[PDB]
Symmetry: D2
Subunit: 114 residues, 4 copies
């Protein structure tokens, strides 16, 4: 299945934060309504934050996460969880190799903000 | 129900990150096996990271998040989600007032690392 | 926080299924847009299904689960999870006593159907 | 990523329930520690329960769900969610064709029981 794609409410501020746990340099691409709106590049084997930004979901609400290492697309896993029918987390793990820890870049999207 | 309490695998490194979305100064206490091991204090209305640390879950694996504003406990909501039977997120929202956005401090615990 | 309340897309068919794990006879009230549309009454200590129905979320999309035993409201826990940005689960546990297993009545809501 | 694989606590009773939403006859295979322990076969386009059983996770705690239609493996999506650090749901969707509703067979695993 396609992973790393989420439908947000329209015109909503959201946070996106990425962590790295890999020997490979991670590139995290964030698209909103099919346009790249943030890129995070970094390397850590100890969960360093490689980016955190506030974005707007726009008219269409479509948010997509892609992750690559050395130009190769990582395999993604994702889900969305909603607490108290209001607090939302869109969650992505990614695997750049074959140990299958899925933590090589970890991305957390949260809304609402403010 | 009690919220904000999670059982991690023993002696495992985990990341804890806290975000703020409130006019109030947030205090986030992180307890491992019933002892405070980290406290994050900060203020933001725009999802600033008020703390991020790597910790160890110790023998018992018990991790608890408490959130307060000027000594008054916030109301917590939480869950744990596991992707690919391997990548774990323990998620906490909190409400310090009456609007019920539950984002006033948001806490993300992730494991494994490395 | 309020638990057991979920916002579904309007006029959408959904499944609701309840399981019992308690000495007490469980009464599960399903409300759609603030009106009772289904009541499941049953008893099991071994996860028997005490109801399964297809319902419609109606104009407002509001679905609320309430659980009682002997006329006393059980304490609820809940969350919603979305897989592949499409497949929805709304999950409720309930506690009728002091052991905090939250499995006394378990309710799973799923959509889409068909 | 591999989907539909879950680690349960050793030697634990759990419930497994399968629902169908497809024109295709669904075959759900439940394996405990790499051995088939249950097979559910049925068809429905209205969320009928095609199987519900209580099973034990055995020494190794490994539970795997596989789904096929006419001998062709369906594509799976899955996650596990834990509420109140106690109530566990292991969730599987599956897709047998091209519409990507992932509801063709839906499997819910719940524990603890009793
Ligand atoms: C520390 C481990 O780093 C690998 C990725 N290492 S790598 O050199 O970037 C690659 C080797 C083959 C393809 S990429 C991670 O996948 C592991 O989980 C570890 O974090
Ligand atoms: C901007 C809003 O801030 C409040 C908290 N306001 S406060 O003045 O810190 C408090 C007043 C009484 C108790 S705390 C948040 O709850 C809202 O969600 C907004 O972020
Ligand atoms: C088997 C256990 O049943 C109780 C509820 N027992 S009861 O007789 O309904 C009550 C007694 C006082 C208040 S309700 C569950 O809460 C336990 O989890 C067990 O399943
Ligand atoms: C009603 C729809 O049924 C299909 C499956 N159709 S089928 O005839 O079983 C197949 C044909 C080729 C491969 S399987 C589901 O995928 C849809 O989601 C609908 O539920
Ligand atoms: Ca890896
Ligand atoms: Ca890694
Ligand atoms: Ca608030
Ligand atoms: Ca707020
Ligand atoms: Ca109980
Ligand atoms: Ca019980
Ligand atoms: Ca389908
Ligand atoms: Ca279908």
């Amino acid at each position: 299945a396609t992973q790393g794609v989420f439908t947000l409410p329209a015109n909503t501020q959201f946070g996106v934060t990425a962590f790295a746990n890999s020997a490979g340099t991670q590139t995290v691409n964030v698209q909103v309504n099919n346009e790249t709106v943030a890129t995070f590049t970094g390397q850590s084997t100890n969960n360093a934050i490689i980016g955190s930004k506030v974005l707007n979901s726009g008219g269409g609400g479509k948010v997509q996460i892609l992750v690559s290492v050395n130009g190769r697309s990582s395999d993604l896993v994702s889900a969305q969880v909603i607490l108290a029918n209001e607090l939302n987390f869109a969650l992505v793990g990614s695997e750049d190799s074959t140990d299958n820890d899925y933590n090589d870049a970890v991305v957390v999207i949260n809304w609402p903000l403010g």
